[PDB]
Amino acid sequence: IGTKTCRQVYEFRVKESSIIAPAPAEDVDTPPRKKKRKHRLWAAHCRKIQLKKDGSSN
DNA sequence: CCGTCCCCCGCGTTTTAACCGCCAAGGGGATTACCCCCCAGTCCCCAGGCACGTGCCAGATATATACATCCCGTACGCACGCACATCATTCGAT
């Protein structure tokens, strides 16, 4: 927005930060990093589903 | 060669226990210092061992015979299949 310069907008966000509760700004990485996810397990996981009810195939 | 089947194997969970990293202690390897008692070395002396012959020995080496062993054929058993008669069952009239 070209109507306002960063100053008094940075300051407006200072006012906004004092009015509105601060944002969480949380970052995650998940416990899994790599490996332990072989696609044969997926096929095995698919095999588990296949034998359960996909055997009918209707 | 036929063909059998099971039993290792991949492959996948999940338990764990090696793995490291560090901490702690002193047992104990390694070293110095001393010294004596201990082996080398000489001299001397002598019987223990080897060389040489010797015979005798029994030790071996050959005989002959009794006996043991293996193998084939044999017959004998025997359970077998084949085959039968007979025990049994069926079709018809009673």
Swiss-Prot record:
Localization per record: Nucleus
Induction behaviour: Expression is induced by E2F1, E2F2 and E2F3. Expression is reduced in cells subject to numerous types of stress including UV-, IR- and bleomycin-induced DNA damage and by activation of p53/TP53.
Post-translational modification: Phosphorylated by AKT1. Phosphorylation by AKT1 reduces methyltransferase activity.
Coiled coil feature spans: none
Residues bearing the modification Phosphothreonine: 30
Tissues of expression: In the ovary, expressed in primordial follicles and oocytes and also in external follicle cells (at protein level). Expressed in many tissues. Overexpressed in numerous tumor types including carcinomas of the breast, colon, larynx, lymphoma and testis.
Function: Polycomb group (PcG) protein. Catalytic subunit of the PRC2/EED-EZH2 complex, which methylates 'Lys-9' (H3K9me) and 'Lys-27' (H3K27me) of histone H3, leading to transcriptional repression of the affected target gene. Able to mono-, di- and trimethylate 'Lys-27' of histone H3 to form H3K27me1, H3K27me2 and H3K27me3, respectively. Displays a preference for substrates with less methylation, loses activity when progressively more methyl groups are incorporated into H3K27, H3K27me0 > H3K27me1 > H3K27me2.
Family per record: Belongs to the class V-like SAM-binding methyltransferase superfamily. Histone-lysine methyltransferase family. EZ subfamily.
Subunit field text: Component of the PRC2/EED-EZH2 complex, which includes EED, EZH2, SUZ12, RBBP4 and RBBP7 and possibly AEBP2. The minimum components required for methyltransferase activity of the PRC2/EED-EZH2 complex are EED, EZH2 and SUZ12. The PRC2 complex may also interact with DNMT1, DNMT3A, DNMT3B and PHF1 via the EZH2 subunit and with SIRT1 via the SUZ12 subunit. Interacts with HDAC1 and HDAC2. Binds ATRX via the SET domain. Interacts with PRAME. Interacts with CDYL. Interacts with CLOCK, BMAL1 and CRY1. Interacts with DNMT3L; the interaction is direct.
Disorder this protein is connected to according to its UniProt record: Weaver syndrome: A syndrome of accelerated growth and osseous maturation, unusual craniofacial appearance, hoarse and low-pitched cry, and hypertonia with camptodactyly. Distinguishing features of Weaver syndrome include broad forehead and face, ocular hypertelorism, prominent wide philtrum, micrognathia, deep horizontal chin groove, and deep-set nails. In addition, carpal bone development is advanced over the rest of the hand.
Stated name of the protein: Histone-lysine N-methyltransferase EZH2
Organism of derivation: Homo sapiens (Human)
Shown segment, full-protein numbering: 458 to 515 of 746
